[PDB]
Amino acid sequence: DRASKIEQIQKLAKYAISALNYEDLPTAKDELTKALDLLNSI
Amino acid sequence: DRASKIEQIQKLAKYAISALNYEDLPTAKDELTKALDLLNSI
Amino acid sequence: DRASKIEQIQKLAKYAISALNYEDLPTAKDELTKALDLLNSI
Amino acid sequence: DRASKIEQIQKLAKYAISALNYEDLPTAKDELTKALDLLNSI
Amino acid sequence: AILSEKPNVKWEDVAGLEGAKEALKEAVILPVKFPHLFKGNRKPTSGILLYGPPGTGKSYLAKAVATEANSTFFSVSSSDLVSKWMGESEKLVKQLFAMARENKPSIIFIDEVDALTGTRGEGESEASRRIKTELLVQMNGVGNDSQGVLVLGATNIPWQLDSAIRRRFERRIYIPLPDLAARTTMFEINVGDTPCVLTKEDYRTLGAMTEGYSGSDIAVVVKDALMQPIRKIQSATHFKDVSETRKLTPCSPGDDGAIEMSWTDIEADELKEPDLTIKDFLKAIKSTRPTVNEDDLLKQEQFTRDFG
Ligand SMILES: Nc1ncnc2c1ncn2[C@@H]1O[C@H](COP(=O)(O)OP(=O)(O)O)[C@@H](O)[C@H]1O
């Protein structure tokens, strides 16, 4: 972990980006969050 | 705006990703934030 | 007649079809009816 | 459905026509009916 | 006997799955953009596999690589490789990589490599052992110049692909089902110069309606849509004048100025084609089922989840 936690944030922040490509704010505001919380979990 | 605000979040969330590629948590926790706040500004 | 009545039902049932090609239910429900009544008139 | 129901009436009303080409009133009076009822089901 | 083309397809022509896009921009454009970085220990990729469900645009993306390649882009299906005799089935492979090295720098594409693999068991014995053996040894071996040419593999069945050829295709990429925005883009591309009727969020409604298609599915619903108002004109009785001197369009039986006639009755030009609008689109969506299956997607998530 960590080396992966740092890798999963990116995985999240990507999905989030991919989500805004359909204006899906819901998913976005969530993944961009599950990600941030985790960067604090670091 | 908006059509752009939605475009600048992605711009942020990218930089954030690019930042974690040097383990730079500082930048990350910031851009991934300036972005989120803005998705709420939507 | 008859040989024609049988020919006019088809004439109707066609118009009806042609009508649904514009979603015109009104015309349809009518021609598909003027036709049916006539097949009973046979 | 609907976009199809509207398409199946035509499918019916065709068979009905095709049927009268053998003077088969039975089939006709039926398909031209299963169709009409369905245009009311719309 | 051997085909070649410099096609039209661009990266902007391709819509969707940008990780494979930047991967091929790296492994193909990076030898073009910076050949001087690749020297000694740093070597370009020799074997790249694309795979997944059918109709996802792997050959089309290979044509994008072809246009931005500036190289002798070969491409072959299995049909130029199946054994009819007992030995042009193999010498043609030898001449394929031979003339591929003759036209170096070059790119080779093979579509559906699953027809050449599967050494496990003894089924499809002589063709599989001889032709597949020559694909292995001739792909790299004793004195093959593995530099230069690039081997692009496609398939729909990657688990029946043998592990040795799986290692030969050293950089493999899964191609998933695409998303909402890319199919919106392919709708707005494939409508082309035809005068449409809808807006961008209506194409978003279309892509929301069409959850889980392929690129060919989009190509045929757009194709059927380019039959739809023409199908209105070829249908039915009754037209009507509207509005530069006389202009008539199809209308229902009994309407404001509804004459009874056929298209044949109506004068050159002075026809008013129905607008192109969605009800025809949604009717075409209700016309055709998605072809692909989801348990096959579960196996693609199995092999992708492991080896991807
Ligand atoms: N990602 C994509 N972007 C643009 N067009 C696509 C894409 N995927 C498929 N298509 C369209 O689908 C058509 C057929 O795809 P094809 O290359 O036969 O799929 P396969 O991957 O099975 O070879 C192509 O003409 C292409 O225009």
Swiss-Prot record, chains A, B, C, D:
Changing K34A: No effect on interaction with VSP4. Changing Y22A: Abolishes interaction with VSP4, no effect on dimerization. It comes from the Eukaryota. It is found in: Cytoplasm; Endosome membrane. Residues 2-42 are annotated as: Interaction with VSP4. Changing E23A: Abolishes interaction with VSP4 and dimerization. Residues 1-42 are annotated as: Dimerization. Has a role in the formation of the multivesicular body (MVB). Required for the sorting of lipids to form intralumenal vesicles and for fluid-phase transport to the vacuole. Required for sorting the plasma membrane proteins STE2 and STE3 into the MVB. Acts a cofactor of VSP4, promotes the oligomerization of VPS4 and stimulates its ATPase activity by 6- to 8-fold. Present with 4400 molecules/cell in log phase SD medium. Belongs to the VTA1 family. Homodimer (in cytoplasm). Interacts with VPS4; the interaction requires the dimeric structure of VTA1; 6 homodimers of VTA1 appear to associate with the dodecameric VSP4 complex; the interaction is ADP-dependent. Interacts with SNF7; the interaction requires DID2. Interacts with DID2. Interacts with VPS60; the interaction occurs at he endosomal membrane. This is Vacuolar protein sorting-associated protein VTA1. The gene is VTA1. The chain holds residues 289 to 330 of 330 of the full protein.
Curated annotation (Swiss-Prot), chain E:
It is a peripheral membrane protein. Changing E112Q: Defective in ATP hydrolysis. Missorting of vacuolar proteins. The keyword Transport applies. GO terms for molecular function: ATP binding; ATP hydrolysis activity; identical protein binding; protein homodimerization activity. Residues 296-308 have a biased composition (Basic and acidic residues). Changing Q95A: Abolishes oligomerization. Keywords: ATP-binding, Endosome, Membrane, Nucleotide-binding, Protein transport, Transport. It is found in: Endosome membrane. GO terms for cellular component: ATPase complex; cytoplasm; endoplasmic reticulum; endosome; ESCRT IV complex; membrane; midbody; nuclear pore. ATP binds at G52, P53, P54, G55, T56, G57, K58, S59. GO terms for biological process: autophagosome maturation; autophagy; endosomal transport; intralumenal vesicle formation; late endosome to lysosome transport via multivesicular body sorting pathway; late endosome to vacuole transport; late endosome to vacuole transport via multivesicular body sorting pathway; macroautophagy. Disulfide bonds: none annotated. Residues 243-259, 293-308 are annotated as: Disordered. Involved in the transport of biosynthetic membrane proteins from the prevacuolar/endosomal compartment to the vacuole. Required for multivesicular body (MVB) protein sorting. Catalyzes the ATP-dependent dissociation of class E VPS proteins from endosomal membranes, such as the disassembly of the ESCRT-III complex. Belongs to the AAA ATPase family. Present with 5350 molecules/cell in log phase SD medium. Monomer or homodimer (in nucleotide-free form). Decamer, dodecamer or tetradecamer of two stacked respective homooligomeric rings (when bound to ATP); the dodecameric form seems to be predominant. Interacts with VPS20. Interacts with VTA1; the interaction requires the dimeric structure of VTA1; 6 homodimers of VTA1 appear to associate with the dodecameric VSP4 complex. Interacts with DID2. Interacts with DID4. Interacts with IST1; IST1 competes with VTA1 for binding with VPS4. This is Vacuolar protein sorting-associated protein 4. The lineage of its organism: Eukaryota, Fungi, Dikarya, Ascomycota, Saccharomycotina. The chain holds residues 122 to 433 of 437 of the full protein.
